[PDB]
Structure formats: structure tokens, C-alpha cells
Design a binder for these strands. Structure first.
Length: 425
DNA sequence: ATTATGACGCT
DNA sequence: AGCGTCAT
């Protein structure tokens, strides 16, 4: 009763840039705006691999991880933008710089954790407190939430339903209690409307967002109403929301662990987990996962929003699938050199922008026929931002994988250079 | 031949 | 340190 903490102490948002690479290409080329369009990488093998898809194109069944030649069967008027190719590989600089534009605007409002190029977590707890003191008991108008869904409402025209749900929520609100978690989430949602408006004004980019009390619920909420909308998931909404939520939809349970939760416990939905004791869950899935699951199925998660706006690693990777696998010494050296030259460019720009230096180089390879995605991962010291030295060291570090008697065997199907372990400079 | 990145845990 | 998991 009075002593079960309910995980309502924070306001946390997850912001996800809608089909981000597509938006970047649509800003640059207005002929692509408001059309079915996708971004591809490469073009020879079956038209290229699609990696991002506008919502217009999604309506035709176009998806990521689809060959462009196949997407054209589903959507013959599909428009395509190609990722830049530099030194023989895909070069994602345009999207990294667009992402920095958006992240810098987000950081004006609250502290953000860069989860990936197109999504960030937002710690709004302090921001909401400041805003609540500014209001001085003044009620929150629907006009302040023009794109917000309240999950679970209305109970008892899509825009019409959104507005009905929002009215029901706002009528119920107790504005005089500056400590009600539901009020705190509502003000969080107001601030996120303002943040998203600023992003769109100042970049042209639209995004979706979730607002809740922790990162996992914010991430789940964000996906409920897309594109260009935001969703508030209150603590009270969790029992019904989880009662028909497939376990795989919760962040970190879409993989082998979620599959084993489903198979070992014989359940399907997140809410069914509430029936098990914390000890039972730990006994099946380990102490950490078990405690996490016990709290998570009750809407409770404690992972903090880490104050981290910059990537922790700077990486360069290329697959060489099928008969493109690298089979000679000269091939491996030339591609290590291309990877190392892009790595050097990005590292020098990073050092000048962000006052830090990487100190460790990680080299990862895949060999043909090897079941694993990484056949080997080894580290060496990263002392100077010099492409020839980095590629020479990466070779020096992988060279004893070659089993020939100038040839390379087994041929390599992936090269990967990652700069890690940053230190202030 | 479901990229090229990124995040993180286990031991 | 090297390997495995999860996500888009």
C-alpha cells in the first residue's frame, strides 16, 4: 500500500525522428516531399537495399531491409534517394549532421541522451517543475496539446477521437496539486509539443514522441501514434495497455530473451508477467533481468536518462557479401585504407567540434562461411589520427587470420574500424 | 546478398 | 579484453 513505490518520480520522453533519412532527402529535394519515397544504399544488386521509408510509401507495404526492385513491385511510383558513396562505401555524413541540428535544438529544453542517430531520450523532470511553478495553478488548455494522444482515452474521425480523449483527460485533471504524477506528465507533454514545434520550425523535420515516467514506457508510447504525433502513457494506463501487449514490443524483449520469457512461462502479453514473484523471474532469467521484469510489467523502470548528446564511438563498416568477399592481401589492405580514411576525416572533425580524442581502435572482421557476425574483434592503441597508420595497425592485428601459403583465405565478408574510449582534449 | 551503424551486458 | 544481444 503506502510503501510500494510506483516509479512516478520522473518525467521522461522518447523523441524519434520520423523516417529520418527520408526527411533529410525531402528537405534537400522538394520534389520528394509528401510522396511515397525511400532511401536506398547502393544500386546494382536488385536496385539497392532500402533503409528508410516515408509513411506514404509504408502504406504500399514498402519496408526497410527490402530490395528496391521489390519495393517497386509494391509501389511503382515510389521515389528513391541514394545514400552518398565515398571511397567505395556508403557515407552517412549528411544524416549525422542533420541529427546534430536536431539534438542541439532538443538540448535547449531538457537534458537529452542520444540513443541513436534518429532518437533521443529527454529528462523533463526539472523542466516540468519549473513550468509548474510558472503556471501558478492555471489550468492546462487543450490548445497547448494540439498533437497529443492520451493512451487509453476516450473510454465509456481520427482527430475527433484524439480530441475526445484529450478533453476527458484534461477535465479529470487536478491542477492544484503540484505533485500529482498525471499533472507532471501533462506538463511534460506541453513542453514536448513546444520542443517538437521548435525542431520543425528550425529544421523542417517532424518527429513523434512518447511521454511517460521512464524510458521504456516513453519508447513504447512513442510508437502508438505515428507519424508527427505524441502519446502520453500515464501510470494508470499501464494495466490495460499491457493486458494485450505482446512481450516482444517492450524495448529489450524483441529478441532471444523475450522469446524465452514467452516459452518458459507460457504467456503472450506483458501484463501476464505480474502473476510471478520477483524470485521466480530471477530464477528463470537471472537476478538482473528478473528484477527488471518484475518492475517493468508494473510500469516501473529505473534506468536513468544519461546526459550524453554525443556518440560514444565513431565507426566505419562495410560488408562484402556473396562473391564480393575479399580474397587477396591487396584487397584487404585497400579496403582497410578506405575505411581508415573515412575514420580519420570523421575523427578530426570530431576532435575540433567536441574537444576529445579517441584512444582505442577496435577492428572487427567476418570471414566467409563463419556463422557469427563478428569472426574476430581485436583492439589496438589509437595514438594519432592518421589513416595509413590505422589501416596498417588493423592489418597487423588481423593478419594471422589468413590461412593461405598474397591470397586471403577464408575470404572476408565484413571489415569494421571503430574509434572508442574518448578522453577530453 | 535483412546496411551501417550505434547502444550495452557477460565473463 | 573478446564475445554476445538488441535495435533501426
Amino acid at each position: 500500500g503506502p510503501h510500494m513505490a510506483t516509479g512516478q518520480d520522473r518525467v521522461v520522453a522518447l523523441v524519434d525522428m520520423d523516417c529520418f533519412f527520408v526527411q533529410v532527402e525531402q528537405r534537400q529535394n522538394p520534389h520528394l516531399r509528401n510522396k511515397p519515397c525511400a532511401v536506398v544504399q547502393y544500386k546494382s544488386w536488385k536496385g539497392g537495399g532500402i533503409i528508410a521509408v516515408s509513411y506514404e510509401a509504408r502504406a504500399f507495404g514498402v519496408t526497410r531491409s527490402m530490395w528496391a526492385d521489390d519495393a517497386k513491385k509494391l509501389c511503382p511510383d515510389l521515389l528513391l534517394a541514394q545514400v552518398r558513396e565515398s571511397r567505395g562505401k556508403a557515407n552517412l555524413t549528411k544524416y549525422r549532421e542533420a541529427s546534430v541540428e536536431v539534438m542541439e535544438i532538443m538540448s535547449r529544453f531538457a537534458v537529452i541522451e542520444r540513443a541513436s542517430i534518429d532518437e533521443a531520450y529527454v529528462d523533463l523532470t526539472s523542466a516540468v517543475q519549473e513550468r509548474l511553478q510558472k503556471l501558478q495553478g492555471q489550468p492546462i488548455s487543450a490548445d497547448l496539446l494540439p498533437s497529443t494522444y492520451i493512451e487509453g482515452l476516450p473510454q465509456g474521425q481520427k482527430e475527433g477521437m484524439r480530441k475526445q480523449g484529450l478533453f476527458q483527460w484534461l477535465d479529470s485533471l487536478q491542477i492544484d496539486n503540484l505533485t500529482s504524477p498525471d499533472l507532471q506528465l501533462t506538463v511534460g507533454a506541453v513542453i514536448v509539443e513546444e520542443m517538437r514545434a521548435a525542431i520543425e520550425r528550425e529544421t523542417g523535420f517532424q518527429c513523434s514522441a512518447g511521454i511517460s515516467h521512464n524510458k521504456v514506457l516513453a519508447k513504447l508510447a512513442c510508437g502508438l501514434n505515428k507519424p508527427n504525433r505524441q502519446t502520453l502513457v500515464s501510470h494508470g494506463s499501464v494495466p490495460q495497455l499491457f493486458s494485450q501487449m505482446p512481450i516482444r514490443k517492450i524495448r529489450s524483449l524483441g529478441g532471444k530473451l523475450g522469446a524465452s520469457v514467452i516459452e518458459i512461462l507460457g504467456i503472450e502479453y506483458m501484463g501476464e508477467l505480474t502473476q510471478f514473484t520477483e524470485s521466480q523471474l530471477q530464477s528463470h532469467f537471472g537476478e538482473k533481468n528478473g528484477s527488471w521484469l518484475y518492475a517493468m510489467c508494473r510500469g516501473i523502470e529505473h534506468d536513468p536518462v544519461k546526459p550524453r548528446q554525443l556518440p560514444k564511438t565513431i565507426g566505419c563498416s562495410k560488408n562484402f557479401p556473396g562473391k564480393t568477399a575479399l580474397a587477396t592481401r591487396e584487397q584487404v589492405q585497400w579496403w582497410l585504407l578506405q575505411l581508415a580514411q573515412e575514420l580519420e576525416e570523421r575523427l578530426t572533425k570530431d576532435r575540433n567540434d567536441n574537444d576529445r580524442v579517441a584512444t582505442q581502435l577496435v577492428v572487427s572482421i567476418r570471414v566467409q562461411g563463419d556463422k557469427r557476425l563478428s569472426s574476430l574483434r581485436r583492439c589496438c592503441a589509437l595514438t594519432r589520427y592518421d589513416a595509413h597508420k590505422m589501416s596498417h595497425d588493423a592489418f597487423t592485428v588481423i593478419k594471422n587470420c589468413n590461412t593461405s601459403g598474397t591470397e586471403w583465405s577464408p575470404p572476408l565478408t565484413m571489415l569494421f574500424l571503430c574509434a572508442t574510449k574518448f578522453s577530453a582534449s
